[PDB]
Design a protein around this ligand. Structure first.
Ligand SMILES: CCCCCCCCCCCCCCCCCC(=O)OC[C@H](COP(=O)([O-])OCC(O)COP(=O)([O-])OC[C@@H](COC(=O)CCCCCCCCCCCCCCCCC)OC(=O)CCCCCCCCCCCCCCCCC)OC(=O)CCCCCCCCCCCCCCCCC
Ligand SMILES: CCCCCCCCCCCCCCCCCC(=O)OC[C@H](COP(=O)([O-])OCC(O)COP(=O)([O-])OC[C@@H](COC(=O)CCCCCCCCCCCCCCCCC)OC(=O)CCCCCCCCCCCCCCCCC)OC(=O)CCCCCCCCCCCCCCCCC
Ligand SMILES: CCCCCCCCCCCCCCCCCC(=O)OC[C@H](COP(=O)([O-])OCC(O)COP(=O)([O-])OC[C@@H](COC(=O)CCCCCCCCCCCCCCCCC)OC(=O)CCCCCCCCCCCCCCCCC)OC(=O)CCCCCCCCCCCCCCCCC
Ligand SMILES: CCCCCCCCCCCCCCCCCC(=O)OC[C@H](COP(=O)(O)OCCN)OC(=O)CCCCCCCCCCCCCCCCC
Ligand SMILES: CCCCCCCCCCCCCCCCCC(=O)OC[C@H](COP(=O)(O)OCCN)OC(=O)CCCCCCCCCCCCCCCCC
Ligand SMILES: CCCCCCCCCCCCCCCCCC(=O)OC[C@H](COP(=O)(O)OCCN)OC(=O)CCCCCCCCCCCCCCCCC
Ligand SMILES: CCCCCCCCCCCC(=O)OC[C@H](COP(=O)(O)OCC[N+](C)(C)C)OC(=O)CCCCCCCCCCC
Ligand SMILES: CCCCCCCCCCCC(=O)OC[C@H](COP(=O)(O)OCC[N+](C)(C)C)OC(=O)CCCCCCCCCCC
Ligand SMILES: CCCCCCCCCCCC(=O)OC[C@H](COP(=O)(O)OCC[N+](C)(C)C)OC(=O)CCCCCCCCCCC
Ligand SMILES: CCCCCCCCCCCC(=O)OC[C@H](COP(=O)(O)OCC[N+](C)(C)C)OC(=O)CCCCCCCCCCC
Lengths: 161, 78, 149, 192, 183, 353, 105, 93, 80
């Protein structure tokens, strides 16, 4: 019983009914959490933790910006919607969940055959660091160049003087 | 000039004294950071005076002998 | 003057760590050792008269892909992921008891069910445009048509 | 197309600087003083403030010289690089390069020199640094490693050219020269 | 490295549930045209204990099998079946000898490894007794290639890293050989 | 029975191990509150709790039970989401962080080569629980605490993360158990004494403990984000905050004092030589000793958490922001360059074994 | 030439060999057109997705359905729960059907 | 750290010596399952005269083991708790 | 349901809600990259995935700063 379906259905229901900005940043948290958990199992545990390390810090900075901008607008603005139409919209979106139309690729399972040739076994993060600092060191240096531009960019935009 | 700000290219030693006294969080953070590359430049001195580098690890797969197969090899046959 | 009443809570906190360490170190070690005795419950539980003193296997940590291969291989030889055996020759059952995991390769559910994340120009083309699938079906059709020759 | 002999497709940083001609230092010096001169020239063309000439402050002159110092060196570095690449007249550089390589070969030493980088890193470093001088105006990147991918054959250093008979250099076979790929994989084919 | 794959057992059953993993068995043996072989029955601990003895005894067959793989140009699994069976029999012979000449020393070593996270640095006392017994009865010596003979870590007198918990059976056996063998 | 019971226990054995593990952490957290009051009392020349249970051993039970028998204050019963979402997220974040804490070699619920990342990532989630309480709240003191809480996170998060990365860089591993075993010959307190002080300062900032107790300053913001909390929401937040104190105290013992490694190797061998390794009694004693070594080191820093509270006044949060960015960050970034330079110079780059 | 298709341990993965043979064919001077390298490109794409092999499996399953063959009579036995890879299924001589321990290795 | 390098070297050579025997066992397993795949395909497609049993790769000089399979009996279908009511793996129950 | 542009309703009616939508959309591409890289056993794709996370984080900081200054300008009299 894939419980990931139920969690996404609940998340999608609140996306259509979210009114204030606080409910929107809560939607973002309710989006990263299914991504991290579904990454923690199945595909990649490494990037599930990397998503938590980086995006959670961004969420707090996002949240503290909301406290400086909320201006009573959505605390009294009315919304109409309707319970019946919201469920109908979510039901129709539930009907089609096939992102690809290659039936053979989606219905036939495959296996891999492991080999003992790799006596030197290390984590994927070490291999990423091996290539990032040697093969693609230019990308790493340009990324630091972009980070430098952001630091200068933030100061000039925000600082009054 | 009992407490003036020294000019770096005229009094380099006095200029360093100003930051060591007024900005300790800057003078000593750079001093610790500088010793990193400094020890890296002293590596050749260690290579000749203390000991040599270790042999590289066999982290490149199975070591295949650089020779043709021995066609005269038998034993443990079917 | 050492106040012993202030040290009473620390002694209980000291016992708190020892409770976790004592239970975890012993129960986990015993469970691994018990399951390494044999493939059936009559050997795991009952200790034979001629059997020697019990040698315990401690929990394994800091593993890699090679240890995952070893654990499956040990399962097919002893019925335990950490079973013990130094036999020179394996049983005949080891030849044909290999385990091969077959699984689907579909995208994560969040990628194809999130109300926002699933929408992109390429994802719509994959989901609603037959241009990619019609062309790729030619390769599948070429396979059968090239048999008779 | 004005083409000359290829010396080194990825010349080392020290090799490029050593092979500087007197004109290369001249262009380096002109770049160093040109940038302060341009600030003087710009003020003469149109003063920064007012209608009369006003010398730029010495703080501007100091930073302008530093910018010109790196700008002049980069220009000189590019000019010397083309001689290794063969895009420019390099008969002086060819003769000097051949003498150094033959001397190293006669000593059973690699012309490229010993390296701290393993076989993968030496090849990786060459890929990053090769032809990087084409973007030297955008951002710097230099060959500061002793790799063996220089786009030349050491066989061409065995043939004797005019003016080299008196060099009296004896060249052993390449398989007996240390730190060469053809003289490392003796025991294992995957380990040097 | 605990990265999930499609080639072996994953970390938890939740990974299997998301992947819908099927653990598939095959009931067919190798075809009769391929000669049958006796598979090695040693588990992880005995194999790690005898790793350097298999290499010393079966070095030429290990190299020949691996040289067959490289010279097969992608057809290694099929072409090198004959070379594979030589390695399996040679490796089995080493384990058979260890069970007939050095069984007490062999079992003491790999049981220490099971007791100490399968780490070589934590069973030097048991390994030293095993290495001495194998040499005196099989003329096989553990050797670590690429380094000078006296700079081998298993022969180091005072290692920086030592086991936290001593193995009592190893300690008793080591003392029984110190006083008796070296009078 | 008998046969059907002797395998039922085996079927449920590992759930008992987890339940015992949960009880082990809760007992330390429960009596840390009692220990803190007792420790501050004698330093302040009072006694601390000694009249709730024999010599005060039931003080933690009374405080928890009384609050669990208190009315929950909320605008409506259906508003149980608002005042419980915050504390539950904070509690789950710190409890999940304990999964990668090894009481012995391999004695951790979660073992992975990325345990360090999981530890830092799980702790960052707990910050989101604190800011949830200030959800367009009508309480002005709750709102002011949320602003201060975000400011403190910006202070310690960069400093705390980089210090842990230096220790991981020294061992070239992000596995906590590998870091513990790497300290057999030297405890990292000696080579990295500045980092241990920096780590402890960041630990105080992370837990909002004095002198960095700006989130819950009684003389500034009555109770901070907990001013509107009562009964169970207060307990869960109170439990989570003290669970972080134990966790950070245990982390300090792991990163710089060898974790569970014995104080003296000779004494460890002598005690274990009194027990037979063929019996389970050896491994019961071994777990007590190894965790006892961790407990003694962890109790010292839990003592130090109380010790600094009773000896230092509170520092303003804006001063804390300048403290981390101007002082702590340059120092830690300097060390992250200094350390590889030393290791490469002497041909001692770390590998995992 | 930049590295592509690098395995999780720093070496070539399963499909690098197919990719390498494609590059060698395309960059070889003896060829006049890229037609001889077309078959090598299909193999590399087959290595990653196995789309043709999955299609072949689709035909075999569909063909057996019209013939009335039961899937369990011509298929391969499988186990869905890892804790139930019992020693009886593995064929051990004294194999029991009790579940195996997969909680903590 | 310098001892860890020597310890790392000892571990790497120990795995290198065990590699040929472990891979030889694995090679036979792959060959055994490769033949089992084509035997299953041959039985299913025997009534089709024009069907050719072969891999989906044009390079016949490179060994490509099939990575698909057709699912048969569900051995642990009847399994409950603490015990697998395992069905017969070799033939009908 | 996607072709009728249903996602335009799931996005809230605030400027910061547009920012959240962009982060989710970019995150979907990164998840897809991890999905492909993990199946292929290709660390190059994981290098791409890490770059996409770092680059997207830079984008959020720049956009927030513009939005911070934009909100500052309206409440910028500060006569008090
Ligand atoms: C251990 C060594 C101490 C010792 O053996 O005797 C003292 C200690 C009892 O103190 P005491 O003999 O009554 O004090 C002497 C006079 O009564 C009273 O003599 P006094 O109080 O006048 O002695 C004064 C002495 C302090 O008294 C001491 O000498 C104690 C030593 C304290 C420093 C080390 C801790 O000096 C100081 O005040 C300065 C010490 C603090 C300076 C800063 C810390 C430096 C370290 O004996 C014990 O070890 C037994 C108590 C230990 C606790 C056992 C029960 C714990 C609870 C278990 C759970 C139930
Ligand atoms: C050393 C002092 C220095 O050279 O800069 C002068 C400058 C004098 O400071 P000041 O006395 O307060 O300035 C008073 C007047 O405005 C000073 O007026 P000014 O016009 O004389 O200074 C402006 C300066 C422009 O300053 C720069 O461009 C320095 C840029 C460095 C990056 O232009 C120059 O003076 C040219 C000669 C000095 C720069 C040569 C750097 C060559 C590139 C390496 O010092 C700095 O710029 C400090 C920046 C670097 C701090 C240390 C960072 C170390 C990072 C690595 C640590 C790990 C190893
Ligand atoms: C959008 C932003 C984009 C990003 C931009 C950001 C910037 C990125 C580009 C940065 C520069 C590219 C470097 C990237 C990383 C490369 C790392 C690397 O390959 O290290 C391998 C290298 C080891 O490779 P190796 O094969 O053993 O070669 C050893 C020497 O490098 C080779 O021995 P040698 O024969 O060349 O001479 C050895 C000795 C000189 O002793 C001699 O005997 C030379 C005799 C002729 C003297 C001529 C003087 C010329 C210099 C003036 O010292 C040297 O002259 C080394 C040459 C480097 C001079 C300083 C670099 C200036 C660059 C500005 O590690 C090093 O220690 C390199 C030392 C150079 C200093 C660090 C270079 C970066 C600064
Ligand atoms: C984690 C355990 C402890 C937290 C449990 C709280 C459960 C509440 C629902 C959790 C979020 C599920 C997905 C919904 C997305 C966010 C929508 C939202 O704003 O929160 C729902 C909450 C319900 O109240 P309601 O009145 O119906 O909504 C307002 C109607 N104008 O309306 C509110 O605004 C109240 C918000 C309270 C604070 C919630 C902050 C977000 C919590 C996220 C943590 C869990 C991560 C997501 C897990 C489920 C993913 C689908
Ligand atoms: C400019 C001076 C650079 C030259 C230098 O400092 O030493 C380079 C050194 C090569 O010299 P050597 O140690 O003798 O080579 C070993 C041969 N078996 O190579 C080395 O030992 C490595 C030197 C590392 C420090 C260079 C980078 C420092 C600055 C980092 C930015
Ligand atoms: C060494 C780096 C600093 C250069 C120091 C030399 C210098 O700048 O000379 C000083 C002079 C400024 O003149 P002035 O300020 O009037 O003299 C002091 C009056 N009390 O400076 C000047 O007159 C400006 C002329 C250029 C000064 C040299 C600029 C190059 C600086 C070194 C660059 C290296 C790269
Ligand atoms: C050693 C030791 O003292 O271990 C005996 C223990 C605990 O003693 P403790 O003083 O509470 O340990 C606290 C350690 N501090 C004082 C450093 C905080 O006692 C028992 O209850 C068992
Ligand atoms: C366990 C060790 C601690 C026992 C302390 C104790 O039993 O405490 C004594 C209790 C509580 O009464 P109090 O007034 O707090 O006693 C403290 C005395 N002072 C004030 C002088 C310090 O009294 C009783 O026995 C009455 C209840 C019957 C026993 C119930 C025990 C509590 C249940 C949970 C623990 C089993
Ligand atoms: C600050 C003091 C740290 C400290 O006292 O701890 C440093 C030392 C011990 O640890 P070490 O010598 O660094 O390494 C570990 C050395 N063993 C093997 C002895 C554990 O503690 C004491 O001997 C007290
Ligand atoms: C030997 C090592 C010691 C060298 C000391 C050199 C100090 C130069 C200095 O401080 O330069 C001075 C300048 C300008 O100072 P100001 O405050 O603007 O004016 C000066 C005072 N007045 C107003 C009276 C004139 O400072 C800077 O550039 C500040 C940045 C320094 C680096 C900060 C980050 C540190 C990171 C450390 C690595 C991880």
């Amino acid at each position: 019983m894939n419980l990931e379906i139920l969690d996404l259905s609940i998340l999608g229901f609140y996306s259509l009914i979210s009114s204030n900005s606080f409910e929107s940043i809560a939607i973002l948290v309710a989006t990263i959490m299914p991504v991290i958990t579904e990454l923690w199992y199945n595909y990649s545990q490494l990037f599930a933790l990397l998503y938590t390390l980086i995006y959670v810090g961004a969420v707090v900075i996002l949240f503290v910006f909301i406290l400086s901008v909320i201006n009573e607008k959505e605390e009294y603005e009315y919304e109409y919607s309707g319970l019946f139409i919201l469920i109908l919209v979510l039901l129709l979106d539930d009907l089609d969940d096939n992102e690809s139309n290659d039936n053979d690729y989606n219905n036939v399972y495959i296996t891999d055959y492991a080999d003992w040739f790799n006596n030197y076994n290390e984590s994927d993060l070490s291999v990423i660091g091996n290539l990032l600092f040697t093969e693609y060191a230019l990308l790493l240096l340009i990324i630091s160049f972009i980070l430098l531009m952001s630091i200068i960019g933030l100061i000039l935009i925000v600082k009054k003087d | 000039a009992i407490g003036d700000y020294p000019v770096y290219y005229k009094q380099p030693i006095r200029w360093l004294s100003y930051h060591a006294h007024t900005r300790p969080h800057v003078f000593y953070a750079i001093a610790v950071a500088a010793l990193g590359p400094v020890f890296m430049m002293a590596t050749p001195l260690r290579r000749k005076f203390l000991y040599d580098d270790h042999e590289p690890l066999p982290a490149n797969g199975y070591p295949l002998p650089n020779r043709s197969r021995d066609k005269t090899l038998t034993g443990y046959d079917d | 003057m050492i106040p012993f009443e202030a040290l009473i809570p620390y002694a209980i906190m000291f016992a708190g760590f020892c409770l976790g360490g004592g239970v975890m170190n012993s129960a986990i070690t015993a469970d691994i050792t018990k399951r390494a005795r044999g493939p059936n419950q009559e050997i795991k539980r009952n200790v034979g008269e001629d059997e020697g003193p019990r040698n315990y296997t401690k929990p394994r940590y800091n593993t890699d892909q090679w240890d995952k291969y070893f654990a499956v291989r040990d399962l097919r030889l002893t019925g335990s992921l950490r079973g013990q055996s130094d036999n020179a020759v394996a049983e005949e059952s080891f030849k044909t008891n290999s385990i091969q995991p077959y699984s689907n390769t579909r995208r994560p559910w969040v990628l194809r069910r999130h109300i926002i994340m699933k929408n992109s120009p390429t994802k719509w083309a994959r989901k609603y445009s037959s241009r990619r699938d019609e062309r790729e079906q030619e390769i599948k059709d070429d396979y059968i048509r090239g048999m008779g020759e | 197309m004005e083409t000359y002999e290829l010396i080194d497709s990825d010349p080392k940083f020290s090799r490029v600087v050593r092979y500087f001609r007197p004109s290369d230092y001249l262009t380096w010096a002109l770049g160093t003083i040109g940038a302060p001169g341009l600030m003087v020239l710009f003020e003469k063309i149109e003063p920064a403030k007012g209608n009369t000439f006003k010398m730029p402050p010495p703080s501007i002159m100091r930073i302008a010289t530093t910018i010109g110092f790196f700008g002049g060196f980069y220009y000189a570095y590019t000019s010397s690089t083309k001689r290794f690449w063969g895009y420019s007249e390099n008969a002086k550089e060819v003769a000097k390069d051949r003498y150094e390589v033959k001397k190293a070969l006669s000593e059973k030493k690699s012309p490229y020199g010993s390296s701290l980088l393993n076989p993968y890193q030496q090849d990786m470093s060459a890929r990053n640094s090769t032809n990087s001088q084409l973007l030297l105006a955008i951002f710097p990147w230099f060959n500061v490693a002793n790799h063996q991918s220089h786009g030349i054959d050491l066989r061409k250093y065995y043939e004797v050219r005019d003016g080299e008979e008196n060099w009296n250099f004896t060249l052993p076979p390449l398989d007996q020269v240390k730190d060469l790929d053809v003289a490392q994989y003796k025991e294992y084919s995957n380990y040097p | 490295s605990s990265t999930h794959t499609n080639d072996s057992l994953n970390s938890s059953n939740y990974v299997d549930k998301l992947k819908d993993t099927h653990f598939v068995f095959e009931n067919d043996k190798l075809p009769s045209e391929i000669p049958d072989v006796e598979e090695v029955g040693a588990t992880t601990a005995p194999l790690l204990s005898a790793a350097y003895f298999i290499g010393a005894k079966c070095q030429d067959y290990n190299d020949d099998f691996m040289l067959c793989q490289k010279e097969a140009k992608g057809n290694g699994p099929i072409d090198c079946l004959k070379e594979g069976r030589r390695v399996t029999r040679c490796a089995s012979g080493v384990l058979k000898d260890l069970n007939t000449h050095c069984s007490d020393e062999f079992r003491l070593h790999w049981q220490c490894l099971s007791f100490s996270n399968l780490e070589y640095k934590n069973c030097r006392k048991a390994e030293s007794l095993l290495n001495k017994c194998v040499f005196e009865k099989m003329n096989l010596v553990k050797k670590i290639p690429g380094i000078p003979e006296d700079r081998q870590i298993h022969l180091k007198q005072n290692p920086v890293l030592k086991p936290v918990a001593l193995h009592q059976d190893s300690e008793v056996a080591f003392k029984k050989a110190q006083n008796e063998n070296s009078i | 029975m008998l046969n059907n019971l002797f395998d039922f226990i085996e079927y449920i054995e590992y759930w008992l191990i987890i339940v015992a593990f949960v009880a082990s952490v809760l007992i330390v957290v429960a009596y840390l509150t009692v220990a803190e009051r007792k420790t501050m009392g004698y330093m302040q020349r009072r006694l601390g709790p000694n009249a709730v249970g024999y010599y005060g051993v039931l003080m933690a039970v009374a405080d928890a039970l009384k609050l669990l028998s208190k009315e929950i204050v909320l605008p409506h019963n259906g508003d149980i989401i608002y005042v419980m979402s915050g504390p539950l997220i904070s509690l789950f974040s710190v409890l999940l962080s304990w999964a990668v804490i090894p009481f012995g070699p391999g004695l951790s619920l979660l073992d992975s080569e990325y345990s360090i990342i999981y530890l830092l990532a799980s702790g960052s989630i707990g910050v989101f629980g604190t800011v949830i309480v200030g959800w367009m709240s009508n309480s002005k003191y709750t709102v002011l605490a949320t602003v201060r809480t975000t400011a403190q996170l910006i202070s310690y998060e960069l400093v705390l993360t980089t210090v842990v990365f230096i220790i991981a860089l020294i061992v070239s591993s992000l596995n906590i158990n590998v870091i513990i075993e790497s300290q057999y010959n030297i405890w990292y307190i000696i080579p990295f004494f500045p980092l241990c002080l920096i780590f402890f300062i960041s630990a105080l900032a992370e837990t909002a403990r004095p002198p960095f107790d700006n989130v819950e300053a009684e003389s500034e913001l009555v109770s901070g984000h907990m001013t509107e909390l009562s009964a169970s929401p207060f307990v869960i937040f109170f439990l989570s905050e003290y669970c972080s104190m134990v966790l950070m105290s245990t982390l300090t013992a792991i990163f710089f004092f060898g974790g569970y490694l014995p104080f003296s190797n000779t004494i460890h061998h002598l005690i274990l030589n009194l027990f037979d390794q063929h019996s389970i009694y050896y491994f019961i004693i071994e777990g007590i000793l190894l965790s006892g070594y961790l407990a003694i080191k962890a109790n010292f820093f839990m003592f130090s958490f109380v010790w600094i509270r009773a000896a230092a006044p509170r520092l303003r949060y804006d001063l804390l922001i300048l403290f981390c960015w101007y002082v702590l960050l340059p120092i830690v970034f300097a060390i992250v360059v200094f350390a590889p330079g030393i290791l490469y110079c002497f041909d001692a780059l770390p590998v995992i074994i | 030439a930049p590295l592509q298709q690098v395995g999780r341990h720093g070496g070539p993965n399963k499909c690098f060999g197919e990719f390498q043979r494609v590059v060698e064919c395309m960059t070889n001077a003896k060829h006049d057109s890229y037609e001889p390298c077309n078959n090598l490109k299909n193999d590399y794409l087959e290595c990653r997705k196995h789309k043709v092999e999955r299609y072949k499996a689709f035909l075999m399953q569909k063909h057996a359905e019209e013939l009335g063959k039961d899937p369990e009579e011509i298929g391969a036995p499988f186990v869905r729960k890892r804790r139930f890879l019992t020693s009886k299924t593995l064929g051990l001589v004294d194999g029991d059907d009790y579940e195996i321990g997969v909680e903590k290795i | 750290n310098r001892e860890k390098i020597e310890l790392k070297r000892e571990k790497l050579w120990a795995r290198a010596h065990l590699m040929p025997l472990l891979q030889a066992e694995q090679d036979r397993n792959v060959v055994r399952r490769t033949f089992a795949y084509y035997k299953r395909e041959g039985e299913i497609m025997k009534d089709v005269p024009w069907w050719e049993v072969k891999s989906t790769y044009s390079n016949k000089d490179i060994f490509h083991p099939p990575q698909t399979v057709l699912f048969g009996k569900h051995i642990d279908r009847d399994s409950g708790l603490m015990y697998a009511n395992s069905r017969n793996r070799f033939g009908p129950d | 349901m996607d072709l009728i542009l249903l996602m335009l309703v799931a996005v809230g009616l605030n400027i910061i809600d547009i920012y959240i939508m962009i982060e989710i959309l970019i995150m979907g591409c990164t998840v897809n990259t991890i999905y492909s890289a993990s199946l292929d056993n290709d660390m190059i794709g994981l290098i791409y995935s890490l770059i996409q996370i770092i680059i997207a984080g830079v984008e959020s900081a720049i956009g927030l700063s513009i939005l911070v200054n934009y909100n500052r300008i309206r409440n910028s009299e500060e006569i008090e």
